[PDB]
Design a protein around this nucleic acid. Structure first.
Lengths: 54, 61, 89, 101
RNA sequence: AGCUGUAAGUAAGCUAUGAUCCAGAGAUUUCCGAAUGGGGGAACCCAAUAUCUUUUAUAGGAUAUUACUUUUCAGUGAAUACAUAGCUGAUUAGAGGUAGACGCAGAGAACUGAAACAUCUUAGUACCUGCAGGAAGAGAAAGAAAAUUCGAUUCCCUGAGUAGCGGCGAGCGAAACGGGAAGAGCCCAAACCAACAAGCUUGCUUGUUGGGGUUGUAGGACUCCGAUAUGGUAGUCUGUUAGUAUAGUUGAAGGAUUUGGAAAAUUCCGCUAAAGAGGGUGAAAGCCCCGUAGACGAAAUGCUGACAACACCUAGGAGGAUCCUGAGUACGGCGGAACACGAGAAAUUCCGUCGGAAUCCGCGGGGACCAUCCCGCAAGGCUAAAUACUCCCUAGUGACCGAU
RNA sequence: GUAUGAGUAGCGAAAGACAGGUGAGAAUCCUGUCCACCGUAUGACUAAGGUUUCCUGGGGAAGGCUCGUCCGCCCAGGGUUAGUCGGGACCUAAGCCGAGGCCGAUAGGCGUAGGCGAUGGACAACAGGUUGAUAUUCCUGUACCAGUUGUUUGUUUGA
RNA sequence: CUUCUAGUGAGAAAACAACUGCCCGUACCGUAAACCGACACAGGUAGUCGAGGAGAGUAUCCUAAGGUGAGCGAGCGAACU
């Protein structure tokens, strides 16, 4: 779960914000699933985003 | 004195190289046992060997 | 290279006694074999050799003028003959 | 150095002013010169390989080269020196009437 | 005309048949180290395969080749037949260091200030990691504005401590107009037309090469006629010279006297200057030495111009029947961030997640939102200069230090 | 940089005495004689560690808690020898590294095949002599291990 | 190391003679004045050998082989520690 093969969606950072405006660090991730695709003949199991399969 | 080393062939080159290396062996044995009045001849032989080797490199491209 | 291998003879009081049993001491090259020295000696004098022995010598701290540092390393080989002789002086 | 090892020379400054002599040795890169009979000094030696009886001995000391002047061999007066174009061994062509030194 | 460094001291030598020394181009260059035949406690140890050597022979010596990944091509090849994993060989590039500087990204504090402290500040600073280049980054309007407009980007002055933001507290803090340095613009996708291969629907659907075509005053395709010339380049290790960096050459004019160990000082009487900058000399020198102002010079190698070739690129007028103009995109809900702008009445620009257009009778913006008017045409690529920095080399400078 | 405390505290367990040498100079260095101390150690051998301190000839400015003619100090020369001993050209433990691989903002974390790694496994020589300083290493005598050269039948396989 | 086959696969068994056999260490200290403790420091340092009388003994006292007299002294013979 590191990138996607066709787009580039990867992980980044964000903030939590809790009702008094305190801020801590945080991780944001893309929605990656392992799929078999035909990239030059032989199938491969790669991580692909659900937005590029849509 | 390369003007003479350029008056020879690549066989007599290797021959004089053998001769001068042997001279160095004998000089080195003189200097240790208390002989060799003329110590400036050790440098001269080193430099004649150097000259033969450069000239042989130059001619074989 | 058979003519850069032997450097020179050793002439000390422990080495004069060896010349009376047919043994000769030379400072030889570092990176030389027992066998390579044997070949070189048989080539440069036309003798027949029994038994090279070989040693390494450590450098010595010296200190001349408020500047200190070591002498060279050394290799010493002692060559025994069957029957023949070399005349060094 | 404008003055050579075999050369007659006169003295401008320093207690031997007006003396002449043949140059004895040149020391370029320290710009000094030994002149015959000019800067006599008195040493004190103890016996060593030369003169196993080391007395009080006297030899010349090197003076600075700008305390000196060349003399035209042919005429005998001290001259500033210039360089001119002879058949191409450029020599010091004297001032004071253009003669070769 | 002397010389064999510091470096004395002695011993042997070299040079007028041109030493030593100086500048351009070459040759040699052990071992460790990315270290790369295998290993390892860096500078060590142990091999395999060919050719060559020592020996009667084995033992011994030398030289080449042998990591890993990628990216191109053959051979062999299979659980599983056809063949794809794999394996062997040939080919192509990387890999590490730094200038303790300058740039663009990823991730990202705290002491501190608020006279306590949570929002806020310190501050997207310090530190760490990636990628660079000689500069980077941005760059050719889905722009700035408001009548009467102007035309790519960057940098400086000013606007201005203003308009704003803010436990509206501490504090943070624009832009456009106006004046300047430097100035420059270009190429694709798509429609369409051919050559080839497959689907031989023998419909013309899939594709590969070449042509065409690059825009908002809408432009192109397409049909109609003209022309088949003319303006340029941000291009090459191609020629012709011109200069230039890296050694050098020449270069004016003073003697006596007094005091001293020694004068450049003192006193007399002269000369020189396109040269009275500076350093040395037994004390303070235009005229003693090295220099200076001025005039001259390069076998060789490297730089920068100019003009030549060679390579590329570039045409009008008309029509408006039809076709083209960048899709999981613009945009919307939810959560975060960036804009001077802390969710606020919040436009504009990003990231994650889910939903999701239109096609010139169109689409976006003018700070919620609507109508009308005005300015533009996103979802493709590149680009000199004007600006930042100095490990280093040359030449200099200082009402900068002078051995705590 | 120099005083005061001050010529003061201290001089780090323990038995010496005399004769004679050397020397400018001797409680302290050399030679002798008697006395005294340790002796499951204060004797002999070795693995770490140190790295020339080892031997011979000179020296006496500093170091040595006094002295010094002396020294583990200073100057000049010299010493360490292996088919068989210990390590490599043999084996593997813990642990470590790891082609491909699997994971993860970056950097990187782990791990398969295969390797490195003794403190363990395997593995052929002994007794005596000799130097101022090395000895299962040099020499003498008598051995052993692995190879090489020469003189002493169908690769089917019963060679 | 020892067997058994599978196996590319002239014909090697064992007599004598004479030859070949590489790299690293190797001095010296090592219950210490040479190592760890800033010192020529009453501390610490793995293993083997470790004799006699009397004794169970490696205890204890005196000794053998071997080692040592310990790097400030000469007097006096008060208080006090």
């Amino acid at each position: 779960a590191k990138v996607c093969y066709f787009t580039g969606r990867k992980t980044s950072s964000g903030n939590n914000r809790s009702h008094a405006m305190n801020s801590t660090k945080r991780t944001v991730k893309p929605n990656l699933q392992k799929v078999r695709v035909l990239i030059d003949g032989k199938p491969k199991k790669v991580w692909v985003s659900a937005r590029a399969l849509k | 004195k390369v003007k003479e080393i350029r008056e020879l062939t690549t066989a007599e080159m290797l021959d004089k190289e053998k001769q001068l290396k042997e001279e160095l062996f004998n000089l080195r044995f003189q200097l240790a046992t208390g002989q060799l009045e003329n110590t400036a001849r050790i440098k001269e032989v080193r430099q004649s060997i150097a000259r033969i080797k450069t000239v042989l490199r130059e001619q074989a491209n | 290279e058979l003519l850069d291998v032997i450097k020179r003879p050793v002439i000390t009081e422990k080495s004069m006694l060896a010349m009376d049993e047919k043994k000769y001491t030379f400072e030889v090259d570092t990176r030389a074999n027992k066998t390579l020295v044997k070949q070189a000696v048989e080539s440069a004098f036309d003798v027949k050799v029994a038994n090279v022995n070989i040693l390494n010598v450590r450098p010595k701290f010296k200190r001349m003028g408020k500047y200190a540092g070591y002498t060279k390393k050394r290799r010493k080989a002692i060559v025994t003959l069957t029957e023949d002789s070399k005349e060094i002086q | 150095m404008f003055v050579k090892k075999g050369d007659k020379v006169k003295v401008i400054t320093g207690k031997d002013k007006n003396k002449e002599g043949v140059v004895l040795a040149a020391f370029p890169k320290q710009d000094k010169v030994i002149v015959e009979g000019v800067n006599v000094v008195k040493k004190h030696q103890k016996p060593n390989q030369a003169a196993p009886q080391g007395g009080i001995l006297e030899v010349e000391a090197p003076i600075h080269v700008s305390n000196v002047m060349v003399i035209d061999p042919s005429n005998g007066e001290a001259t500033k020196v210039a360089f001119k174009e002879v058949d191409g061994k450029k020599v010091r062509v004297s001032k004071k009437t253009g003669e070769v030194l």
